[PDB]
Amino acid sequence: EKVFFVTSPIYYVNAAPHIGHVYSTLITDVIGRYHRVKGERVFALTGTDEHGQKVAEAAKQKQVSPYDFTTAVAGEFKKCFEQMDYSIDYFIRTTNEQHKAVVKELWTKLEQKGDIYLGRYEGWYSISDESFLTPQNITDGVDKDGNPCKVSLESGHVVTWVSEENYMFRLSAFRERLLEWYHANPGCIVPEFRRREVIRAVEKGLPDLSVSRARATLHNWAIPVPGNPDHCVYVWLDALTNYLTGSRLRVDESGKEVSLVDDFNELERFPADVHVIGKDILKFHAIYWPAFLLSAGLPLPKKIVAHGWWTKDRKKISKSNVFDPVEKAEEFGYDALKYFLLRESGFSDDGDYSDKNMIARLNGELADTLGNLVMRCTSAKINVNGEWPSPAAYTEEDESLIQLIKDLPGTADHYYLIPDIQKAIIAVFDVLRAINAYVTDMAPWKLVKTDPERLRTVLYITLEGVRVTTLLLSPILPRKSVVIFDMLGVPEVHRKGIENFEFGAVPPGTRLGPAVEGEVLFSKRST
Ligand X SMILES: CSCC[C@H](N)C(=O)OP(=O)(O)OC[C@H]1O[C@@H](n2cnc3c(N)ncnc32)[C@H](O)[C@@H]1O
Residues found near ligand X in the complex (CB under 6 A)? 9-12, 20-21, 23-24, 49, 239-240, 277-278, 280-281, 309-310, 317
Angle between helices 452-472 and 396-417 (to 10 degrees): 10
Kindly state the smallest distance separating residue 21's Cβ from ligand X, in Å.
5
The Cα–Cα gap between 362 and 364 comes to 6
How many CB atoms sit inside 10 A of residue 105's CB?
18
Query: 49 or 89, CB closer to ligand X?
Result: 49
Instruction: With beta carbons less than 8 A apart as the criterion, state whether 178 and 184 touch.
Output: no
Task: State the first-to-last Cα distance of the chain, in angstroms, to the nearest integer.
Answer: 49
Q: Quick one: 195 or 480, whose CB is closer to ligand X?
A: 195
Q: Per DSSP, what are the bridge partners of residue 173?
A: none
Task: Report the nearest approach of ligand X to the CB of residue 335 (Å).
Answer: 20
Amino acid at 311: T
- 8 Å CB contact between 233 and 107: yes
Q: Which is nearer to ligand X, 24 or 210 (CB)?
A: 24
- Tell me the closest approach of the beta carbon of residue 22 to ligand X, in angstroms: 9
- Find out whether 248 and 99 touch, Cβ atoms under 8 Å: no
Residue 324: CB minimum distance to ligand X, A: 14
Contacts of 32 (CB under 8 A, 6+ apart): 4, 6, 42, 43, 44, 87, 88, 89, 475
Backbone torsions φ then ψ of 315, nearest 5 degrees:
-85, 150
Between residues 20 and 391, which has the closer beta carbon with respect to ligand X?
Answer: 20
Distance CA 471, CA 17 (A): 31
Q: Are 102 and 260 in contact (CB under 8 A)?
A: yes
> How near is the Cβ of 444 to ligand X at its closest, in Å?
44
CB of 405 to ligand X, least distance (A): 34
Mark the breaks in the chain: residue after which each occurs, C to N over 2.5 Å.
320
- Residue whose CB is less far from ligand X, 239 or 476: 239
* DSSP letter string, 372-410: HHHHHHS-TTT-TTSB-PPP-PPPHHHHHHHHHHHHHHH
- State which residue, 26 or 373, has the beta carbon closest to ligand X: 26
Quick one: 284 or 388, whose CB is closer to ligand X?
A: 284
CB of 286 to ligand X, least distance (A): 12
From CA 455, how far away is CA 377, in angstroms rounded? 12
Nearer to ligand X, 281 or 286 (CB): 281
Give how far the C-alpha of residue 464 lies from the chain's centroid of Cα atoms, to the nearest Å: 29
Query: Min. distance of Cβ 134 from ligand X in angstroms?
Result: 20
Q: Which is nearer to ligand X, 241 or 469 (CB)?
A: 241
- From the CB of 30, what's the least distance to ligand X, in Å? 14
CA distance 34 to 184: 27
Closer CB to ligand X, residue 318 or residue 385? 318
Instruction: Decide if 216 contacts 229 (C-beta within 8 A).
Output: no
What's the rounded Cα separation, in Å, for the pair 134 and 138? 7
Q: How far is the CB of 341 from ligand X (least distance, A)?
A: 9
